């Protein structure tokens, strides 16, 4: 029931290759080697080049409707997708990169410091803010 990632990146660019409602964006990390590739709903959450977003992951807080108005809300963000990750690739050196697909939305992460944080399970909630 813990978090598995926290880091702010900066939109290097936003791509809409023939998609009226979705854009695959990329951005590097502000701390370290860490790049980010992510598809996203430009309609629900607009985003242009050069933005300060905070990306998170982890597993926790059938599928109940709302009613949770009076319940947990690990939604302290403005975009929360659920999906699964498929391949665990190694890009030379000891640099790793996991691939996450959200029921149709692909994603790639890169770096090397979640050697005991990012698991190989299906669980995975993406979060973003500001």
């Amino acid at each position: 029931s813990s978090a598995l990632f926290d880091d702010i990146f900066t939109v290097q660019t936003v791509d809409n290759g023939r998609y009226n409602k979705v854009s695959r964006i990329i951005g590097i990390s502000t701390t370290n080697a860490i790049k980010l590739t992510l598809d996203i709903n430009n309609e629900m959450f607009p985003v242009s080049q050069d933005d300060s977003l905070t990306v998170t992951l982890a597993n926790s807080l059938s599928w109940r409707p709302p009613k949770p108005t009076d319940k947990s809300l690990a939604d302290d963000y403005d975009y929360v997708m659920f999906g699964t990750v498929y391949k665990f690739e190694e890009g030379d050196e000891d640099k790793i990169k996991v691939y996450v697909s959200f029921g149709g939305l692909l994603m790639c992460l890169e770096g090397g410091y979640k050697s005991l944080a990012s698991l190989k399970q299906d669980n995975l909630y993406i979060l973003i803010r500001r």
Binding site: N20, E43, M44, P46
Partner: protein
């Protein structure tokens, strides 16, 4: 007054434009079709031809009369031949009509006006050859020459549009909502510009324009529907809406009633 609300626009005798707001499309639509198909009416159903020298065949005319619009005001205080305890038919559930046409005027025409009402109306608005024609003989049944005769005898009954189209009093019904595609319940086809190539609807003036600077609203739902209820006669454009609103209700009722009949046991 309360929940959903109406705001009639220009309304006449054969139409009833109006805006229905504060309702779920789901429910608007439901009412939509209910008018189109399940309001009790009154049409000729049984035809007992005696003589017929017309160039048209028996069942061809038979069809014709099935379509001729009859009165259906107090149609609700009549019973379905299926429930009436009378073998076949009677005054308490049917309207009988006569039709005699002798060719005398050396092309004589047969208009729905030429129908008699041989059975006892029991003093209730019903069984009348709805005429809206300028002269006074709406619906030309058929023509005949020199000495061609034609004797019928019609029997009208309740029934609905499900059972047959010859019933539903609706006949075309306009329905639109959110003229400015804000809900994005559509993806406009286009060669270059959707907006310029796609006709703007006369309905766009009772709702506010898009406004570019605004992002896509998502939490918004289909509220408000611009309609128009045309009528063919039988029932007054107003009723063809009321009664509709009501039958749908009667059904929603038994679903709750039928329910009860199943708790005791």
């Amino acid at each position: 007054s309360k929940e959903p609300k109406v705001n009639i626009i220009n309304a006449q005798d054969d139409e009833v434009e109006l805006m229905l707001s504060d309702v779920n499309l789901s429910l608007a639509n439901s009412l939509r079709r209910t008018m189109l198909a399940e309001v009790p009416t009154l049409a000729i159903d049984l035809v007992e031809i005696k003589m017929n020298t017309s160039v048209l065949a028996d069942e061809f005319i038979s069809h014709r009369l099935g379509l001729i619009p009859l009165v259906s005001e107090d149609v609700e205080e009549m019973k379905y031949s299926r429930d009436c305890t009378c073998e076949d038919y009677c005054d308490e559930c049917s309207v009988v009509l006569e039709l005699s046409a002798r060719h005398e005027g050396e092309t004589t025409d047969v208009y729905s006006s030429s129908l008699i009402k041989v059975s006892g109306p029991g003093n209730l608005n019903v069984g009348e050859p709805v005429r809206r024609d300028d002269y006074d003989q709406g619906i030309l049944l058929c023509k005949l020459r020199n000495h061609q005769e034609l004797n019928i005898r019609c029997i009208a009954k309740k029934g609905i549009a499900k059972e047959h189209a010859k019933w539903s009093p609706c006949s075309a019904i306009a329905f639109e909502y959110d003229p400015h595609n804000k809900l994005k319940h559509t993806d406009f086809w286009f060669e270059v510009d959707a907006k310029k190539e796609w006709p703007d609807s006369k309905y766009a003036t009772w709702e506010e324009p898009p406004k570019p600077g605004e992002v896509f609203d998502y939490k918004a739902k289909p509220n408000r529907f611009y309609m128009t209820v045309e009528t063919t006669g039988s029932l007054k454009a107003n009723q063809v809406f009321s009664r509709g609103i009501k039958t749908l209700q009667e059904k929603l009722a038994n679903v709750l009633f039928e329910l009860e009949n199943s708790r005791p046991a």
